Amino acid sequence: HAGMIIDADYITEDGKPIIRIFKKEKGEFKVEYDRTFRPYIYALLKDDSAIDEVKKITAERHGKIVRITEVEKVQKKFLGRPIEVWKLYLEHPQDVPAIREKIREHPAVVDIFEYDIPFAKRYLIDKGLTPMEGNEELTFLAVDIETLYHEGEEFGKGPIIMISYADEEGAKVITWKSIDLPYVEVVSSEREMIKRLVKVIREKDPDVIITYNGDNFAFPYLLKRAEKLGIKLPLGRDNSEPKMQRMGDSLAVEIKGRIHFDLFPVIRRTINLPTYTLEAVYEAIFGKSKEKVYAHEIAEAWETGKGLERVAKYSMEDAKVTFELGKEFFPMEAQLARLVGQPVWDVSRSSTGNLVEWFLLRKAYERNELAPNKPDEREYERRLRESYEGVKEPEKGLWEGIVSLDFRSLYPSIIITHNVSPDTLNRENCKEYDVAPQVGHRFCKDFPGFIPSLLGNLLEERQKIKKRMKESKDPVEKKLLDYRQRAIKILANSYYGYYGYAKARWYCKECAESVTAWGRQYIDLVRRELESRGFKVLYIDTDGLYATIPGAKHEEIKEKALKFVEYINSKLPGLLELEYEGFYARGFFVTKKKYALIDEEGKIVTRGLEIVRRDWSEIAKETQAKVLEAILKHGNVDEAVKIVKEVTEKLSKYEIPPEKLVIYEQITRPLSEYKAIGPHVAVAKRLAAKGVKVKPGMVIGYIVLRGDGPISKRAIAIEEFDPKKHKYDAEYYIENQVLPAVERILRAFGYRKEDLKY
DNA sequence: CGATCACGGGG
DNA sequence: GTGTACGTGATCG
Ligand SMILES: [Mg+2]
Ligand SMILES: [Mg+2]
Secondary structure: OOOEEEEEEEEEEOOEEEEEEEEEEOOEEEEEEEOOOOOEEEEEEOOHHHHHHHOOOEEEEOOEEEEOOEEEEEEEEEOOEEEEEEEEEOOOOOHHHHHHHHHHOOOOEEEEEOOOOOHHHHHHHHOOOOOOOOOOOOOEEEEEEEEOOOOOOOOOOOOEEEEEEEEOOEEEEEEOOOOOOOOEEEOOOHHHHHHHHHHHHHHHOOOEEEEOOHHHHHHHHHHHHHHHOOOOOOOOOOOOOOEEEEEOOEEEEEOOOOEEEEHHHHHHHHOOOOOOOHHHHHHHHHOOOOOOOOHHHHHHHHHHOOOHHHHHHHHHHHHHHHHHHHHHHHHHHHHHHHHHOOOHHHHHOOOHHHHHHHHHHHHHHHOOEOOOOOOOHHHHHHHHOOOOOOOOOOOOOOEEEEEEEEOHHHHHHHHHHOOOOOOOEOOOOOOOEEEOOOOOOEEEOOOOOHHHHHHHHHHHHHHHHHHHHHOOOOHHHHHHHHHHHHHHHHHHOOHHHHHOOOOOOOOOHHHHHHHHHHHHHHHHHHHHHHHHOOOEEEEEOOOEEEEEOOOOOHHHHHHHHHHHHHHHHHHOOOOOOOEEEEEEEEEEEEEOOEEEEEOOOOOEEEEOOOOOOOOOOHHHHHHHHHHHHHHHOOOOHHHHHHHHHHHHHHHHOOOOOHHHHOEEEEOOOOHHHOOOOOHHHHHHHHHHHOOOOOOOOOEEEEEEEOOOOOHHHOEEEHHHOOOOOOOEOHHHHHHHHHHHHHHHHHHOOOOOHHHOOO
């Protein structure tokens, strides 16, 4: 029909699957049901006669036997060649994992294909359905919670003490203690506060629920407390509860009929930050400071009843900026969903590698191209161990007035012009081919490759959008078209990386190597042209470079660099484009994707160096921050080396507060399941021995004490530490904490680990 | 050594 | 759900 598709899933009714398509039609929520779409896989057989044995293969599920309902001989393409496979139909999606191994094991079966595509994704592809089409306006609600937390408690032990939400009508706080603020609704209990959140969500009926780390905190915490309090959370538009899906080592939460938009994985991909706290994220995007009120300050205010107005304001600002950030980041995710043809829920939680793959699976269907399979563990491992031939060590020391150049828009044009594809690689009986420089891989020119063909269409579509943008008087159309052309740029600039992605179906080591080798000819041209203009290249990798004019005035460097980019792009043919990325007052480079810079507004920017994580001591993270600050803010490496030397001496003379030595590590499974007992497990087992209910999710704080052997046998629980009796291991905090934190940084200045002590 | 195990965001 | 991240660095055995 007419509506915008926002999501799709399936339900089972009388044992049979039913697809649900969630739509928004002129402001109204609509669900379309489809009972007719059938699950399937493909099987390549050694001979057609074999189908008679194969169609009779069975399996078991839900106490019932699983059978192949129908078989169909089909003509498709595999690796740019016609092939005949058998389409095997199944009644239920859950029949596919139950029977697939029993088909694959059969001696007459060469291989099986497309056996791990989720039903809802299979449906959108096969039916040619695209989410997020049209000008349909969605509604948004940001949600956040504050809880009572004490160090090392099991997840969900303390109550939720506040629930905040925000939309265009304002930011509000729901709490069960008396706070006199205009945006605070006081209720009688935690139970009544959670039921109030349920009522707000059911009444506001948002299409999109925005959270900041809601997948792994707000919603698992709400579900834990609702379970304890024996109450339901009917937040789904079908009155279903939020659903926790194990997505890797972490969680993802869905709300049926809506889009649960968690900003945390979204922003982590979009921008570069050493730490993605909401306060650091808000400041990077809106250029305004946001105060952080820490867990201990919140617990103290709740328990004493003093300073609750500050905690309520913190809760309110958390929802207010979550709404603001959601409106900022949602349009690009909506266009990416549309482009790749999968819902925002899925697209916002995936890498660019998986965005490419879903775009390719859809295009393979449209072109009757059988998809290759994801690799098994051994293949994936063999791919990670593959060595690529044919990006030097960066210049040492501290440089001033650094311009950053980006090469990424070069590679789609290389893939297309040289027909770089796994289906064109080293083709037999090829009349014409392109030979990659240095590496010598041959790509057949006789037919367009599957991936070059698609990229060519993407680039052409982006140029049409850019042309329609120049000719548009409507600023609403322009804004939308700007997002659409940026979505293409993002997807197209991900193919180069996708070729080398070990999990990729269309993985091609020789394709990735060849793109690099052809790419290098232009990079070498950019580098020679920069050096002829007095520029010194400080750092270069496949994504870009950093350069300066040694000792030149900063405005002269900026002007010359901007003039250079305009010049080289006038020389480069086709859609090959170099981009001026930015300018930095100072910076230094350690190795590949290990560097630190500082811009003219004094903001430090690093890659592959900062260690802001709870399993490193504060003394190591504080010393590291001080070293970066001495180098970038003071331009003084000598001050940085003196900071390390002073810290190490203070550690040796037991002059460092024990609180700066605490290491935190989470328990992730029952204690009896550990194969290797690390210091936090050794500490945990002693706590459980004393009667402490140790559970997965509990974070263990410990200090390493002086003594013989592995650190596991010398770690003490932070609560058991007695400064009068226990002596911390100075050698451990020096050699395993402080020195590894700074040694990579100071190696860029010619210092070895042994020169950072008195 | 190879294997195992943790980090992030959020209170 | 036709499912179970990612890349990297510390410590155990
Ligand atoms: Mg879903
Ligand atoms: Mg909050």
